[PDB]
Amino acid sequence: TNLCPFDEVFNATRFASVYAWNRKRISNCVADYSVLYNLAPFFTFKCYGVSPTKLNDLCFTNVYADSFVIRGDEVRQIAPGQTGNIADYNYKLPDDFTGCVIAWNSNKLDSKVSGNYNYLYRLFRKSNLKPFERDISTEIYQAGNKPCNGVAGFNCYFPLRSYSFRPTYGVGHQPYRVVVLSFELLHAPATVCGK
């Protein structure tokens, strides 16, 4: 009677950057849906392809728990069929995404007075990300005609930037911790059931 490790994902002390988003593979457990069952109004809760009141009555093959950090103006992109720097270059959700997204304002946790430059994001990429693609490459992005060869220069920039979360910023520039729960049902034994 193992319980699905959801506390380890929501109650984590440190979250990942959006470009290197962390994923916890949860399987063969009993799902105590309660972290999402009754969520307060100050929680952004959007489910796609599945109803939350029905999750206790469904068994899935695997459930994926993706967690990372973005700013408030970018949470609208963590959704199926969305475009933008986060959706295209950091964390993309498919068009037929089956699962829920959870986001809450973490300005009291991830924002320092002198700036919290620890959280990063990808600004430049040659093409868009496929759904559930994770690109941790830090190769100098070529924006011009001459090859970079690992040289930061004109039309040759480092593809990652910092967020600089300061508490005195607006709500759209404050850090939001996002947890994306994917519910997968493939030709396999269903093991993640509810109770």
Partner: antibody, heavy 118, light 110 residues
Framework: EVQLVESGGGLIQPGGSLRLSCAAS????????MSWVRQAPGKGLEWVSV???????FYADSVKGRFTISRDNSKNTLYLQMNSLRAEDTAVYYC????????????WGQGTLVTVSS | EIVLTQSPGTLSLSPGERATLSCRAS???????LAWYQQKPGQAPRLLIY???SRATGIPDRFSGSGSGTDFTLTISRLEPEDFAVYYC??????????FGQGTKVDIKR
């Protein structure tokens, strides 16, 4: 040798269409944030559209449904198709490469004039 | 969205004086999301400063920027007769696209 040469402006009747070009040199359009900024005669600057290196397009609320930003990698030229033009669309249109946090909007086109009149 | 408001509207100073062009945003944004542009008559705007304080390539030393939150400043020390232009501040924190300022016109006396 970093240029952004524009062309295709001129007189167009209200409700007609016109397509602007932004020939690029030494800058690759398909690997950059390329935008279209317009400036009404005697007013400030207004950002109109942008295209990402991945192909994502975005438009300002004042040109939505009427403008379409595109590109051609073989010609290395940014385009802007304008439909249903009216009096407000009369401006000098600029293209420019966006660097966002890592350089703002450094290089700009010389700008072509679009006069909508009858 | 974010609204940008500059001040003053017109600034007439003698050559060699110090200019101070103000710019403020409706929302408290990071200092790295601001930029200043100079537009001389008949020309396209050229970047002067990005990230509020970093000077672009080839811009003279006399152009410097500062400020954070909602109080950004462009200082033009040792004003020269070729500095006659309109100066705009822009913000690219409300992606996609940017929002320009109303523009400060700088006249030059003699």
């Amino acid at each position: 040798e970093v240029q952004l040469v524009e062309s295709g402006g001129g007189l167009i009747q209200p409700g007609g269409s016109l397509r602007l070009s932004c020939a690029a040199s030494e800058i690759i359009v398909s690997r950059n944030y390329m935008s279209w900024v317009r400036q009404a005669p005697g007013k400030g600057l207004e950002w109109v559209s942008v295209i990402y290196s991945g192909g994502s397009t975005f438009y300002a609320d004042s040109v939505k449904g009427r403008f379409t930003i595109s590109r051609d990698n073989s010609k290395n030229t940014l385009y802007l198709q304008m439909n249903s033009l009216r009096a407000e669309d009369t401006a000098v249109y600029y293209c420019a490469r966006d660097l966002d946090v890592v350089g703002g909007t450094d290089y700009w086109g010389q700008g072509t004039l679009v006069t909508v009149s009858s | 969205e974010i609204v940008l408001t500059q001040s003053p509207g017109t600034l007439s100073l003698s050559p060699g004086e110090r200019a101070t062009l103000s710019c403020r945003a409706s929302q408290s944004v990071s200092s790295s999301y601001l930029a200043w542009y100079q537009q001389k008559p008949g020309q396209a705007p050229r970047l002067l400063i990005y990230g509020a304080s970093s000077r672009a390539t080839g811009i003279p030393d006399r152009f410097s920027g500062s400020g954070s939150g909602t109080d950004f400043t462009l200082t033009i020390s040792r004003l020269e007769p070729e500095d006659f232009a309109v100066y705009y501040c822009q913000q690219y924190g409300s992606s996609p696209g940017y929002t320009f300022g109303q523009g400060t016109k700088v006249d030059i006396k003699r």
